[PDB]
C-alpha cells in the first residue's frame, strides 16, 4: 500500500524538457508533464539507441574511382515481409 503519498491520479508522472535549439532566431525550450513509459529490455538497449543499426551506402562504377563514395548512418529500421 502506497496511497498516502503517491495517489493513483498522479502515479508515475514526471516533467519532460525539450529543446528546439539550432543556433537560430526561432530557438525555443519547452517543459511538459507526462506519464512515463518503459519496458523490460532497456537494461542494455536504451530507448535513444534501441533498434538502431548502421547502414552503409556505396556509390561506385568500374573505373570511376574519382566518383566513388561511401556513407554511414543509423536510423530506425523495420523488416520487409
Amino acid at each position: 500500500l502506497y496511497n498516502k503519498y503517491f495517489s493513483a491520479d498522479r502515479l508515475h508522472k514526471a516533467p519532460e524538457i525539450l529543446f528546439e535549439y539550432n543556433k537560430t532566431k526561432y530557438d525555443r525550450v519547452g517543459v511538459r508533464y507526462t506519464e512515463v513509459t518503459s519496458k523490460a529490455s532497456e537494461r542494455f538497449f536504451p530507448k535513444s539507441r534501441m533498434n538502431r543499426a548502421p547502414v552503409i551506402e556505396i556509390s561506385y562504377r568500374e573505373g570511376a574511382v574519382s566518383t566513388a563514395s561511401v556513407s554511414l548512418s543509423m536510423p530506425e529500421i523495420s523488416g520487409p515481409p
Binding site: G63, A64, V65, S66, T67
Partner: protein, 164 residues
Amino acid sequence: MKSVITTVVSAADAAGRFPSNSDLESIQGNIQRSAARLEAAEKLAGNHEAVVKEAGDACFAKYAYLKNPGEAGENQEKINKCYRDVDHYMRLVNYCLVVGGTGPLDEWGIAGAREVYRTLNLPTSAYVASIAYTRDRLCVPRDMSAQAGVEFSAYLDYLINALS
C-alpha cells in the same frame, strides 16, 4: 571554327552591324576563362605520349575480340593505326582547349566520322571506351586544377556524345 569571337563576329556580320557591348563582353569572358582553359592544354601537351598509350590498351582490354583475325585489329599495323587515331583525337581536344570553342573537333574529327567508321567497319564504341577511360582517370586536385579539370572533361564528354 566555332569559338567565342567567331560567333559574335558572324552574328554582327549577318546583321550587318558594328560590334556593340554584347560582342565585347563575350571576349571579356574568354579573357576571364583563358587562365583556367590554357592550364589543361599545356599539360595535355606534356603528358600525351603516356595518356594515349595507356588509353589505347584500355580499348583492347574492354574488347579483346578486336585482335581476332578478320577484325579491325588483326595485325600490329592496324593496332598502330588505332593508337594513331586515338592520338589524333587527343590532339584535337588539346586544340579546342586552346581556341575556346569546339571548332577543331567538329571541323576535323566529328564531321564525317560516322561514314568512315561505318564503311571501314570500325567499331564506334571502341573509341568511346578509350575516351571514357581517360575521362574518369582525371582526379581533379592532382593532375590539373579544379577549374582546368572540368573544362578538360567537358570537351571529352562532348566528343563522347558526338560519337555516340
